[PDB]
């Protein structure tokens, strides 16, 4: 009986592969051939934020494109002012092993996380003026690797127990569980309409989830190692991934298959982050060799570099209006480029 | 605008008040020593943790030695894959690796050796030093001194091994027990001494779960680690 199920699964995989092969008729490189190259991009460090005692693990931009939050090994959450560089808050965490941070779209909350199997919620708009912890959401059986907001009362969190979850903060309970991954879920990304999200999970496969029902609509494979970062395209019909085999890939939801690969022989490090620009023409990746690269999303060429860090680049971020990009690093400094 | 000036002044005041507390926190962060505790179910790391103390993802222990502060982080309630959350411990002074020497054949000793080799050769832990505890010495001695359990069955090289010159047997111990102990220690040292780098070393001890000198050994090994780091920095070592 079990062998029959295995053979049927193999046949279904063959059927899906045949369908995908049938659908393909031309390459994205062929389609976007006559388009003129972007040329060359030379951004420059406009700011440099200091105040963290150790290596930075995460940062998330605010919806107003002015404030941002960051998390560090020293166990501190800091809210900056990008324009002036004056700190606005410094929240002390109960644990120093934090892997992710997020800011609410309203701007009244931030979310911590990490190896203690929890992401907490902190209220920035207390009348007393003190940033206290509001909710503490428990229930994951492995470390937390992402904790992202949908609104002021919904958060979607990734975990190192192979499952994602949706929480309603008011009562502090789960509402759905997203099972089906075999490895460790390592990243997250909400759709622009916030009706679907993607995730790569350390088994070299990304998935497509329906938030309302809680099921895996699509599965994307093609990477050779662990997937570290994942971003959505501006229009919501594609996404990009970053893995440990030193390459990035572009996938299309409707076509159901890969479109392009962003790799080079000289690159043998792992991608830690990926992000798209405002119009989606540029794909920016931060590597383990202390540098970030600027890729032409439609042409696959290399256009620039962000070489201003002296240790691992662990995080990336573009503003909600394309004004600038931030990058944290293991050398404890946040840098802003333009 | 006067309102803009007032807002900017208040912003600068808040920034200064935050910088002051960060400066106060930097000293406490710099004058504290963080240690990662590894091991296995077989190894008596639980008893060692109890002696040091005398769905949480990590457990934390704090002990003080001569006005020095140590933070020992014990991983608990995590899946069995390690290649991801082992990178969170790049900046710890030492790793306390507890391995039960009285557990040779499943080949628990071989599994422990493989884990040690992987941790030693990892890329984000290439400047961390290991304080290796070889536990269950009494059980090892009792097993070897009387029984048909033969190490050469599972470690064939044990046949052509004799106690090293620098051995310091405990007065009142069998040559066979001493030979077995030092063979296991040499097996663990063969991996670490082969690096030939100079940025990290191993510190082996022969321990029992109820030993009262483990905290002193950790203290002395941390002192040696820091002294060696400085000596290497100043071009002496």
């Amino acid at each position: 009986e079990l062998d029959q199920l295995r053979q049927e699964a193999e046949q279904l995989k063959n059927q899906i592969r045949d369908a995908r092969k049938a659908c393909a008729d031309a390459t994205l490189s062929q389609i976007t051939n006559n388009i003129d190259p972007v040329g060359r991009i030379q951004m420059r460090t406009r700011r440099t934020l200091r105040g963290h005692l150790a290596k930075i693990y995460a940062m998330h931009w605010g919806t107003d494109s002015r404030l941002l939050v960051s998390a560090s090994q020293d166990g501190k959450l800091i809210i900056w002012d990008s324009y002036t560089t004056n700190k606005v808050h410094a929240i002390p965490l109960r644990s120093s092993w934090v892997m992710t941070c997020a800011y609410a779209p309203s701007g009244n909350y931030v979310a911590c996380g990490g190896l203690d199997n929890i992401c907490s919620i902190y209220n920035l708009k207390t009348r007393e003026g003190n940033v206290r912890v509001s909710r503490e959401l428990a229930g994951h059986t492995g470390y937390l690797s992402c904790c992202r907001f949908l609104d002021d009362n919904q958060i979607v969190t990734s975990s190192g127990d192979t499952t994602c979850a949706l929480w309603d903060i008011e009562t502090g309970q789960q509402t759905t569980t997203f099972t089906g991954h075999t490895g460790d879920v390592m990243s997250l990304s909400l759709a622009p309409d916030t009706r679907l999200f993607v995730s790569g999970a350390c088994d070299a496969s990304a998935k497509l989830w329906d938030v309302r029902e809680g099921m895996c609509r699509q599965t994307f494979t093609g990477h050779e190692s662990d997937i570290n970062a994942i971003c959505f395209f501006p229009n919501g019909n594609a996404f990009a991934t970053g893995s440990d085999d030193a390459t990035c890939r572009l996938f299309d939801l409707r076509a159901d298959q890969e479109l392009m690969t962003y790799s080079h022989d000289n690159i043998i490090c792992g991608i830690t982050s990926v992000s798209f620009s405002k119009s989606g023409r540029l794909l920016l990746a931060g590597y383990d060799d202390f540098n970030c690269n600027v890729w032409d999303a439609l042409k696959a060429d290399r256009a620039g570099v962000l070489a201003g860090h002296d240790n691992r680049v662990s995080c990336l971020g573009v503003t909600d209006d394309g004004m600038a990009v931030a990058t944290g690093s293991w050398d404890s400094f946040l840098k802003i480029w333009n | 605008t006067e309102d803009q000036r007032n807002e900017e002044k208040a912003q600068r005041e808040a920034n200064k008040k935050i910088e002051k507390q960060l400066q106060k926190d930097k000293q406490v962060y710099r004058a504290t020593h963080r240690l990662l505790l590894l091991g296995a179910g077989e190894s008596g790391k639980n008893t060692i943790v109890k002696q040091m103390r005398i769905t949480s993802g990590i457990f934390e222990t704090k002990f003080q030695v001569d006005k020095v502060n140590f933070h020992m982080f014990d991983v608990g309630a995590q899946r069995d894959e390690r290649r991801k959350w082992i990178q969170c411990f790049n900046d710890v002074t030492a790793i306390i690796f507890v391995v039960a020497s009285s557990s040779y054949n499943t080949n628990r000793l071989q599994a422990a050796l493989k884990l040690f080799d992987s941790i030693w050769n990892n890329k984000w832990l290439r400047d961390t030093s290991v304080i290796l505890f070889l536990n269950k010495q009494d059980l090892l001695a009792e097993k070897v001194l009387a029984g048909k359990s033969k190490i050469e069955d599972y470690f064939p090289e044990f046949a052509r091994y004799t106690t090293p010159e620098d051995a310091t047997p405990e007065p009142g111990e069998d040559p066979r027990v001493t030979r077995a102990k030092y063979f296991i220690r040499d097996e663990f040292l063969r991996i670490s001494t082969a690096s030939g780098d100079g940025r990290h070393y191993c510190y082996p001890h022969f321990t029992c779960s109820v030993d009262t000198e483990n905290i002193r050994r950790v203290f002395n090994d941390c002192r040696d680690i820091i002294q060696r780091m400085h000596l290497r920095q100043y071009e002496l070592l």
Partner: nanobody, 128 residues
Framework: QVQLQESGGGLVQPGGSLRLSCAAS????????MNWVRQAPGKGLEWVSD????????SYTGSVKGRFTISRDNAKNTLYLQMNSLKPEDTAVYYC?????????????????????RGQGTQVTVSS
């Protein structure tokens, strides 16, 4: 997608010889360090041997030294484990786990929670 398929098992009289093989696809074979593991009934998984990318850093477990030999051919993406003079204690399932990442000298690939880059297995039995 990463694929590892092992074949060449069966039942062999004690003192005989065998040869397992494994074919890999979906990744560059020459950039990863291969590996063999096994799981006897009633026991957990145990590491057997491994080999480097170029094929010059072989190493075996204690209880198989001299008998087993591991060789990899990067021109055909295949791994082999020549077993000689088997014993009744070598009855188990043999897998072909792989390095988690390329170009590294590390490995965490014996985990009970199914390692993603591990094969399905091949049955080897030794009886009189």
């Amino acid at each position: 997608q990463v694929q590892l398929q092992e074949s060449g098992g069966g039942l062999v009289q004690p003192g005989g010889s065998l040869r397992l093989s494994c074919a890999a696809s979906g990744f560059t074979f020459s950039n990863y360090k291969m590996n063999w593991v096994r799981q006897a009934p009633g026991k957990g998984l145990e590491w057997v041997s491994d080999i480097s990318q170029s094929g010059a850093s072989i190493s075996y477990t204690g209880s198989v030294k001299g008998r087993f030999t591991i060789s990899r051919d990067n021109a055909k993406n295949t791994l082999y484990l020549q077993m000689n003079s088997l014993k009744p204690e070598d009855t188990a399932v043999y897998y072909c786990a792989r390095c988690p990442a390329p170009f590294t000298r590390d490995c965490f690939d014996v985990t009970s929670t199914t390692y993603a880059y591990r094969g399905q297995g091949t049955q080897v039995t030794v009886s009189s």
